[PDB]
Amino acid sequence: FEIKKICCIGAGYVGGPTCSVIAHMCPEIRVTVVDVNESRINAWNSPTLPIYEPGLKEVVESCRGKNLFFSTNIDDAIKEADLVFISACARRIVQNSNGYKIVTEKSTVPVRAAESIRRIFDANNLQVLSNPEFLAEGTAIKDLKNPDRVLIGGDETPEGQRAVQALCAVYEHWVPREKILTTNTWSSELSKLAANAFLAQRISSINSISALCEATGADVEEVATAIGMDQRIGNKFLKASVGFGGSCFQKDVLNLVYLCEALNLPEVARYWQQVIDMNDYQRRRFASRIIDSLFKKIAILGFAFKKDTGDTRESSSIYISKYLMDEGAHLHIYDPKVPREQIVVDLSDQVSRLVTISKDPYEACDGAHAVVICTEWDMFKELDYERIHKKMLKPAFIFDGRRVLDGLHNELQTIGFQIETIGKK
Amino acid sequence: MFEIKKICCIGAGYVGGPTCSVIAHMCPEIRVTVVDVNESRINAWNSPTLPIYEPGLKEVVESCRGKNLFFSTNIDDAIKEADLVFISACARRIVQNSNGYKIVTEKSTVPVRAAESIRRIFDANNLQVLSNPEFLAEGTAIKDLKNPDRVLIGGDETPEGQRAVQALCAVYEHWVPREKILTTNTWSSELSKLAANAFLAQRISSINSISALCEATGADVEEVATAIGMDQRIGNKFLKASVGFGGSCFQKDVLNLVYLCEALNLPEVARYWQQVIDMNDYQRRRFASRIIDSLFNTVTDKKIAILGFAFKKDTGDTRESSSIYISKYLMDEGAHLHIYDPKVPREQIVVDLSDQVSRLVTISKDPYEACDGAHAVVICTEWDMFKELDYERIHKKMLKPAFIFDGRRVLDGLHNELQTIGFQIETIGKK
Ligand SMILES: O=c1ccn([C@@H]2O[C@H](COP(=O)(O)OP(=O)(O)O[C@H]3O[C@H](CO)[C@@H](O)[C@H](O)[C@H]3O)[C@@H](O)[C@H]2O)c(=O)[nH]1
Ligand SMILES: O=c1ccn([C@@H]2O[C@H](COP(=O)(O)OP(=O)(O)O[C@H]3O[C@H](CO)[C@@H](O)[C@H](O)[C@H]3O)[C@@H](O)[C@H]2O)c(=O)[nH]1
Numbered sequence: 060f061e062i063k064k065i066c067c068i069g070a071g072y073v074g075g076p077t078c079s080v081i082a083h084m085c086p087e088i089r090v091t092v093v094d095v096n097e098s099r100i101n102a103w104n105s106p107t108l109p110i111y112e113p114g115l116k117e118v119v120e121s122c123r124g125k126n127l128f129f130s131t132n133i134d135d136a137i138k139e140a141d142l143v144f145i146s147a148c149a150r151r152i153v154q155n156s157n158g159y160k161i162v163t164e165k166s167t168v169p170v171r172a173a174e175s176i177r178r179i180f181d182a183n184n185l186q187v188l189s190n191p192e193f194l195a196e197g198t199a200i201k202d203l204k205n206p207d208r209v210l211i212g213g214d215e216t217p218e219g220q221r222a223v224q225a226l227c228a229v230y231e232h233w234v235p236r237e238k239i240l241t242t243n244t245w246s247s248e249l250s251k252l253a254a255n256a257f258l259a260q261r262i263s264s265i266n267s268i269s270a271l272c273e274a275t276g277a278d279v280e281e282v283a284t285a286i287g288m289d290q291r292i293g294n295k296f297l298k299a300s301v302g303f304g305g306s307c308f309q310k311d312v313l314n315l316v317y318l319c320e321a322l323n324l325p326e327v328a329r330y331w332q333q334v335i336d337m338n339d340y341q342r343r344r345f346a347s348r349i350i351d352s353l354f355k356k357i358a359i360l361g362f363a364f365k366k367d368t369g370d371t372r373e374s375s376s377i378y379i380s381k382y383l384m385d386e387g388a389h390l391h392i393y394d395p396k397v398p399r400e401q402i403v404v405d406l407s408d409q410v411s412r413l414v415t416i417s418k419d420p421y422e423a424c425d426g427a428h429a430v431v432i433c434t435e436w437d438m439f440k441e442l443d444y445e446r447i448h449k450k451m452l453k454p455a456f457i458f459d460g461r462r463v464l465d466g467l468h469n470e471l472q473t474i475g476f477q478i479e480t481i482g483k484k
Numbered sequence: 485m486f487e488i489k490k491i492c493c494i495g496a497g498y499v500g501g502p503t504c505s506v507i508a509h510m511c512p513e514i515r516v517t518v519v520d521v522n523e524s525r526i527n528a529w530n531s532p533t534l535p536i537y538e539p540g541l542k543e544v545v546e547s548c549r550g551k552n553l554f555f556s557t558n559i560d561d562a563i564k565e566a567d568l569v570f571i572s573a574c575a576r577r578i579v580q581n582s583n584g585y586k587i588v589t590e591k592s593t594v595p596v597r598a599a600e601s602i603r604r605i606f607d608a609n610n611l612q613v614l615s616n617p618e619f620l621a622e623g624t625a626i627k628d629l630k631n632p633d634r635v636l637i638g639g640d641e642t643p644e645g646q647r648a649v650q651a652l653c654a655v656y657e658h659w660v661p662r663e664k665i666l667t668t669n670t671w672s673s674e675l676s677k678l679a680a681n682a683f684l685a686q687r688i689s690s691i692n693s694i695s696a697l698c699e700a701t702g703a704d705v706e707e708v709a710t711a712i713g714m715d716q717r718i719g720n721k722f723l724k725a726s727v728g729f730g731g732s733c734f735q736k737d738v739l740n741l742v743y744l745c746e747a748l749n750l751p752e753v754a755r756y757w758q759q760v761i762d763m764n765d766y767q768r769r770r771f772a773s774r775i776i777d778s779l780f781n782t783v784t785d786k787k788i789a790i791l792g793f794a795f796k797k798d799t800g801d802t803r804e805s806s807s808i809y810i811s812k813y814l815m816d817e818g819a820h821l822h823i824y825d826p827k828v829p830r831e832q833i834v835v836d837l838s839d840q841v842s843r844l845v846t847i848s849k850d851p852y853e854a855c856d857g858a859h860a861v862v863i864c865t866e867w868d869m870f871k872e873l874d875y876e877r878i879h880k881k882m883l884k885p886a887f888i889f890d891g892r893r894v895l896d897g898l899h900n901e902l903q904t905i906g907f908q909i910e911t912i913g914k915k
Contacts, residue, residue, distance in 0.1 A: 208715070246704065249694075249698070249701065253697075254715055263756070270753050277671055277672045282675055285668075285673075291687075292683050292721075295716065327696050327763070327766075333759045337753070340753075
C-alpha cells in the first residue's frame with residue numbers, strides 16, 4: 060500500500076505542527092488539516108498562526124497551499140484521504156469513507172482509544188493504528204524533524220502489518236528505520252502512557268529533593284548535578300520547579316492510576332498516584348512560602364506551562380495565582396505569548412477585582428511588593444532589575460520558581476532584593 | 485597545603501577492600517593499609533582466596549599487595565601512622581591513636597548525618613572530617629573505581645576544610661580527571677548520595693510496576709522498556725524488570741530518606757519515597773504468588789529448584805537479596821528447596837533462611853543437582869551461566885509437568901527452544 064493523501068482531524072498543538080512537518084518532508088503527499096473551528100482554521104491560513112511554536116510559521120508557509128492545506132470541509136478531506144489522523148469521531152469517518160483507509164490515533168488518552176474506535180468500525184474496509192506523538196510543546200518542530208523514536212502500533216494480522224508499514228513508509232522520508240518502533244496496538248498505547256509517567260516522575264522526584272534541600276540548607280541544583288552525572292540516571296528532566304504543567308502529564312498519570320484500579324492493581328495505583336501528590340504539594344509549598352514571606356500587589360511573571368508556548372493548560376501559574384487570589388492578593392500578570400483573554404478564562408467576580416493583565420513586565424512590577432517567576436521565559440533573566448527595584452514597593456521580594464535568576468543572586472541582593480528560590484534555604 | 489602519603493581504612497568489606505586496592509594500584513607512592521577487627525577476614529585478604537568475589541579484584545590486589553597495599557588487624561598502629569583515615573563510636577578509637585593533623589573521611593551512605601556525628605565527637609575531646617561516598621556497584625566494583633562517572637567529596641567551607649578536601653582530590657587526580665570530581669560541603673555530599681541511590685531504586689520499582697501492568701494486559705515489559713528507554717531524557721539504563729532489587733544499600737537508603745523526611749516534618753516527601761519500597765515488596769510477593777498459583781495452589785513437599793541466591797550477578801553478596809524472600813515465602817508454604825549459587829558460600833545461605841531450614845532446604849553443588857527431581861525451577865539471580873545450561877538434560881531429570889519461573893528475564897530468546905523441549909515457562913512482565 061502507498062499513502063498519497065492524509066487527512067488530520069484536529070488542528071491543535073499536535074495536529075497542526077505534525078502535519079506541517081509531514082507535508083514539508085513528503086512533497087509528494089497532500090496533507091489536509093481539518094477542524095470544526097472555523098476561527099482556528101482561518102488563523103492557520105493567516106499570517107498569525109493560532110499557536111505559538113518556534114519555527115512553525117516557516118515550516119507551514121514552506122508547504123502551505125502546495126501540499127499542506129487547512130480547511131473546515133471535514134467530510135471531503137476524510138473521503139479523499141488514504142490515512143486519517145485523530146489528534147464518536149469514528150462515526151463521522153464511516154459516514155464519509157469507502158474502500159480502504161487507515162485510521163490512526165495520536166492522542167495518549169483515553170487509554171484504550173484505538174480499541175474503542177476499532178469497536179465502532181466493526182459495528183457497521185478500515186484499519187486502526189496507534190501512533191502517539193512524542194513532541195513537546197515549545198520544541199515541537201525540532202522534535203518532529205529529529206525524534207528519538209517513532210512508535211507505531213497495529214494488529215498482528217496481514218492487514219494490520221500492511222497498514223503499519225504503509226505508515227512507516229511516510230516517516231522513512233526523514234526518519235531512519237533504526238528509530239522507528241513497530242508493535243501491537245496496545246503495547247504502543249501502554250508504552251506512551253508509561254513514558255510520560257516516567258518523565259513526570261523525574262520532576263516530582265527532584266521536586267521532593269528540593270523540599271529536602273530548603274529544609275536542610277543544601278542546593279537542589281548542586282544535588283541534581285551530582286545525581287545527573289550518573290549515566291544510569293541521566294542529566295535531563297532534573298530541573299526543580301514550582302510544578303509540572305501541560306495537558307498530558309497529570310492526565311496521563313491519572314489515567315494510568317485508573318487503569319490500574321480497573322485491573323485490580325491497587326498498589327501500582329498508589330505508586331503512581333504519588334507523582335501527582337508530590338506535584339500538588341510542591342505547588343502548595345511554593346504558594347505558602349510566598350504568603351509566609353509577606354508577613355498587596357504581586358507581579359506574576361509567566362503564565363504558560365513552560366517557555367516558548369502560549370499554552371496554559373494545567374500551568375502551575377494558574378494554581379499559584381488562584382492560591383494568592385484566595386488570600387486577597389492583587390495580581391499583575393505578564394506573559395510574552397499567552398493571550399490576555401485566556402488568562403482571564405483560566406482564573407474564573409474574583410477576577411474583576413484582583414487580576415490585572417499587563418502588556419509588559421515592568422508594568423506588572425510597578426508598585427508591587429513581590430515578583431513571582433512561574434515560567435522559565437528567557438527574557439526574564441535579561442530584564443533591567445535596577446529599574447524594577449526602583450518602581451517596586453519596598454521591601455521588594457523575588458520568588459524564583461524556575462531557577463532562572465541563578466547567577467544573578469549577587470547582583471540582585473546588592474540592588475536591594477530579597478530573593479527566594481526553590482530548593483534553597 | 486597538604487600531601488597524603490599514608491592511608492588507613494577501617495573496614496575490609498565490599499567497599500573498603502576494593503577501593504583501597506585500586507588506590508594503591510593507581511598511587512604507587514602512597515602506602516595503603518586496610519585494617520579490620522576480623523582476623524579471619526584479614527587473613528583471607530592476604531590469602532590466595534579473597535574473602536569476597538569481585539571480578540578482577542585479585543589481580544588488582546596482588547599487583548600492589550605487600551608493596552604499598554597492606555591488610556592488617558593492627559588497627560591502632562595504622563591509624564597512628566596514617567594521614568587520612570577512611571571509615572567504610574569508631575571516632576573514639578581514632579582519637580585514642582591520633583596526634584596532630586589527620587583527615588577522617590566517611591564513605592558509608594547511612595546513617596544520614598554520619599560525618600556530622602563524627603565531627604561532634606572530635607570537638608568533645610587536629611582532625612578534619614570529610615564526606616566521600618562510594619559510587620561503585622558490587623559485581624563491577626573494579627571497573628567502576630578505575631573509571632567512575634563522578635567522584636563526590638564534601639567538606640567544611642573553612643580554610644582547613646578546603647585544604648583537606650583538596651588533599652583528597654589530589655589522591656583521585658592520579659587517575660580521575662578533574663572534570664569528574666565534584667567538591668561541595670559535607671551535607672550536600674551526603675544528601676546527594678542518598679538521593680542518587682533513591683532515584684536508582686525508583687527506576688527499578690517503576691519498571692517493575694509496569695511489568696505488573698504488562699502481565700495483566702498481555703504486553704511485554706522488555707518491549708515497553710525499550711520504547712521508554714529510547715527517550716534520551718529518560719535513558720535506557722536500570723530499566724530491567726526483576727523479582728525485586730536487593731543489596732545492602734537501596735532499601736536502607738530509601739528508608740533512611742523516609743526517616744529524615746519525617747524527622748524534618750515533610751510527611752508527603754516521606755510517603756512519596758516510601759512507595760519505592762512498597763512496590764519492591766509487592767513485586768516479590770507477586771512473583772512468589774505466581775509460583776504457588778501455577779503449582780495448583782500448593783507447593784508443600786513439592787521439590788523446587790532455586791537458581792541464584794546473590795542479590796545480583798558476579799558477587800557472593802546476599803544482603804537483602806530477593807532470593808531470600810522468595811525462598812522464605814515458599815518454605816512457609818512447605819516447599820522443599822534446592823538452592824544453587826555459583827559464588828554464594830553454603831553457610832551464608834543457611835544463615836539467611838533461619839528447624840525450618842533443616843527440613844526444607846538443600847544446598848546443591850551444581851545446577852543440575854538442584855533441578856534433579858524438581859517440579860519447578862526458579863531463576864532469581866541473572867548469572868550468565870544459567871542461559872547456557874543443558875535444558876534438554878534438565879527437562880529429562882525433572883518431574884513433569886516441568887515449570888520454569890524466570891524472574892530476571894535471562895531465558896529470553898530461548899522460549900521457543902524451551903517450549904518445544906517441554907517446559908512451561910513463566911516470566912516476569914509477560915502474560
Ligand atoms: O526538568 C523539567 C522538565 C519539565 N518540567 C515541566 O514539566 C512540564 C512538561 O514539559 P514538557 O514535557 O517539556 O512539555 P509537553 O509538551 O507536556 O511534553 C510532554 O507531553 C507531550 C505530549 O504527550 C509528550 O509528547 C512529550 O514526550 C512529553 O515530554 C512543563 O510544565 C515543564 O515546565 C519541569 O518542571 N522540569
Ligand atoms: O536494571 C536494573 C538494575 C539493577 N537491578 C537490581 O537492583 C539491585 C541493585 O544493583 P546495583 O545497583 O547494580 O548493585 P549495588 O552494588 O547495590 O550498587 C548500588 O549501591 C552502591 C552502594 O551505595 C552504589 O555505590 C551504586 O552506585 C549503586 O548502583 C540489584 O539487585 C540488581 O539486580 C534491577 O533489578 N534492574
